[PDB]
């Protein structure tokens, strides 16, 4: 279906000694494909998916050059924002940046985004028109006026509608064997008696990709809200994801209850019931 490419940057200052810790990760959909860690030994942008290793040395030299420059930009920003907010040199602070582009199922541009946060709160973000900025506070409007002067939204809109979608489209074909494969959830139901009159039914979705999924409980064909627990989708560690939903039922009444599983890898949604 639809697809995205996204880059995530975190930089954390170290007041006690040295320069900030800097971590950058790149994703196509839910697949991490590149990484950079300032405390790693290589000091290079590194591959994390087999289909990006095909790329030649021009690619890896350029991506290393870029990400190391971005590390320095965040370093400067950490100092600048420390002044904007009148904070001491004694504390540790955080800058985070995320940007990327989505394409539709026809692999054509859908939307772009570029967002910036200081100490875990919105600082400045590009609006969906890719022309305007949302500044969260007055420090951020200082940045906004600076970026209006420097044509920043211009360059971002060019990349996000052009370069970004072009290279996403290149990755999708080079990595076709995994990136365009859907892994539908392997589902089953487990039963856990909690007394001689009550039991937990747990509906499991395992080893699925992409991470987006809906698990819902129904009782007698209608949405069951009470006594349900739904955990956050979580990585399996092998590139796929897991999720479960549970409901407490009176013992012997298990058949009234159905778990419903929606996922891009299933042509029609799935229905499970304890026997």
């Amino acid at each position: 279906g639809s697809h995205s490419m996204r880059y995530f940057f975190t930089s954390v200052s170290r007041p006690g000694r040295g320069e900030p810790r800097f971590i950058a990760v790149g994703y196509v959909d839910d697949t991490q494909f590149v990484r950079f860690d300032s405390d790693a030994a290589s000091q290079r942008m590194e591959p994390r998916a087999p289909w990006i290793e095909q790329e030649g040395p021009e690619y890896w030299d350029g991506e290393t050059r870029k990400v190391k420059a971005h590390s320095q930009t965040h370093r400067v920003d950490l100092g600048t924002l420390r002044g904007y907010y009148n904070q001491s040199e004694a504390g540790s602070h955080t800058v985070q940046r995320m940007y990327g582009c989505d394409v539709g199922s026809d692999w054509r541009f859908l939307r772009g985004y570029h967002q910036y946060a200081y100490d875990g709160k919105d600082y400045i973000a590009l609006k969906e028109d890719l022309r305007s900025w949302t500044a969260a506070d007055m420090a951020a409007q200082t940045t906004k006026h600076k970026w209006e002067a420097a044509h920043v939204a211009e360059q971002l809109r060019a990349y996000l509608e052009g370069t970004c979608v072009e290279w996403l489209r290149r990755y999708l074909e080079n990595g076709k064997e995994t990136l365009q494969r859907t892994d539908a959830p392997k589902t089953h139901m487990t039963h856990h008696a909690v007394s001689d009159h009550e039991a937990t039914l747990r509906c499991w979705a395992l080893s699925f990709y992409p991470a987006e999924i809906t698990l819902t409980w129904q009782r007698d064909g209608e949405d069951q809200t009470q006594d349900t627990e739904l955990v956050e989708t979580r990585p399996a560690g092998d590139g796929t994801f897991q999720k479960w939903a549970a409901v407490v039922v009176p013992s012997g009444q298990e058949q009234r209850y159905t778990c419903h599983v929606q996922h891009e890898g299933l042509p029609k949604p799935l229905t499970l019931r304890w026997e």
Binding site: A69, H70, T73, T80, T143, Q155
Partner: peptide, 9 residues
């Protein structure tokens, strides 16, 4: 592929 340049805040 990363964006080539980020202006400072």
């Amino acid at each position: 592929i990363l964006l080539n340049k980020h202006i400072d805040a």
